[PDB]
């Protein structure tokens, strides 16, 4: 399936600080990641992902490019739990991240938790979306927001990135309730179905 590089964008933030379904959102993030990434490395071996901090007051990579457990290793340690949006920056990093993605012919992909109220500007958002589509990044987002984060950038964005779907962007905006993220997104073409372009 997938030969492309991915990035995992985690906000550990006003949502992740706060359990959206067990045990925390931020924790609900976690095993969903490996779940995803498993299927990602099951998509193909060599399928690579990044992991950054969209959380806190500091954007940064948490797990760099790899292809196995070293992420699951890397993700093992915490984050600022109540932290705040670096998303644009984080994404813009995740972009540059994918600009260094290893042994290319790997297309660019990004997977983004939304644990933050999502403060950004539409143009910047779409400049990202442009830059992505320019860079030709696959972009799928994990969002359970207040309301959710939607009718917003995230909605324009997946569109704005997207001439072709998974060569640019697909969306899922995570729902509340006994909605297991990995169970939820098992549906969405964030994972499975058609996996790359």
């Amino acid at each position: 399936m997938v030969l492309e590089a991915t990035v995992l964008v985690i906000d550990n933030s006003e949502y992740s600080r706060n359990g959206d379904f067990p045990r925390t959102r931020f924790e609900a993030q976690i095993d969903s990641v490996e779940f995803i990434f498993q299927a990602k490395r099951n998509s193909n071996p060599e399928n690579t992902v990044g992991l950054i901090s969209g959380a806190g007051a500091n954007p940064r990579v948490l797990s760099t490019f790899t292809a196995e457990f070293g992420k699951i290793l890397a993700g093992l340690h915490d984050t600022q739990i109540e932290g705040k949006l670096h998303m644009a920056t984080a994404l813009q990093i995740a972009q540059l991240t994918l600009k260094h993605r290893q042994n290319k012919v790997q297309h660019q992909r990004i997977v983004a938790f939304v644990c933050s109220p999502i403060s950004d500007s539409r143009d910047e958002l779409i400049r990202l979306a442009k830059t992505l589509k320019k860079n030709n990044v696959a972009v799928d987002i994990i969002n359970f927001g207040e309301i959710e984060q939607n009718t917003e950038l995230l909605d324009e964005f997946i569109a704005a990135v997207n001439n072709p779907q998974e060569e640019t962007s697909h969306l899922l905006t995570v729902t509340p309730g006994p909605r297991l993220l990995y169970e939820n997104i098992a549906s969405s073409p964030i994972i499975l179905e058609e996996g790359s372009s």
Binding site: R17, N18, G19, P22, T24, E27, I81, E82
Partner: protein
Amino acid sequence: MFNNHEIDTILSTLRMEADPSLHPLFEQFEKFYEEKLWFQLSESLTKFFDDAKSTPLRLRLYDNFVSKFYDKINQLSVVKYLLASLKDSKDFDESLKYLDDLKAQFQELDSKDGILLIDSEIARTYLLKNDLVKARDLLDDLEKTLDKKDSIPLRITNSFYSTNSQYFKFKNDFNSFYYTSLLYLSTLEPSTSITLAERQQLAYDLSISALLGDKIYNFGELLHHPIMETIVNDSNYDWLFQLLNALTVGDFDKFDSLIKVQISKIPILAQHESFLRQKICLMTLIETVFVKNIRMLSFEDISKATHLPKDNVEHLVMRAISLGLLKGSIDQVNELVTISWVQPRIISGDQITKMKDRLVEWNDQVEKLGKKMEAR
């Protein structure tokens, strides 16, 4: 009110779900307390707003999901309030009651982050003063703890300095304290939104502890920083401002006029203003009057030029680091101060140009000599 009632229920309440907040007994007691806009500190983002100053008896109901504080609202999250806000409940046994429950819970139960509580519990004790002894003792431990720490919060010292100040606040040593609090302001300087009655009254006590400092003067200070208007204004701040005036003017009865009890409560400023007037006269007498490689100032008329008299000169001027400060010595006969530095100072615009001039003067001229020597 909306924040508590509407926020308590919708707030979190559900952050958060089927918890003790919106539980039978739970929602009642606030409603039982009020919807009336004074409240119990409302569980996350609005308690994150709410210090709300009706005493929380959601004391208990904040304390829910605190077992879930693992998987639930999680941060410091607690002495954010309570241990902050009900620290401000202002009883004696109260704090002590929850001091061992919170320090033993968020440090054991949840642990078996707390450092900032470790200071809160320890620091909070010290509000109660109880006895500078036990205060300082574990305070210095609280300090000793703090020492090695690289702590992202200033809040730790913003606890501690306030705390350690609080310690000195009970005390004199505003030389320390005022400074210590002066430290604390520089610690609060980035962060920690506060109240004016917190703002000035501290900065008052600060501005006061300038007096019960007084000092290695000082003279000029954090008055620059937004303690002013803010502090002065009026009341003793008038004084505190007029004292800044006396920190320049140094006329006794421009102030010994003003003196009421509190300032006359320590009369030693009457010495300190002499200490001032001298030093106040001195500093500029020092900073400028000689510019021309400033030293001499020696003594008497120059010392009476402080318009404090010659036989006190025979002390005040005579004393130097017996003023805590001055260097140099005395020619008794010729009536000459020997002086040296231990005088800091300020201003701008002036020697600025002079600076590079000579220092480019040799410089340029050097190049003449500086022509061939090691080259050739």
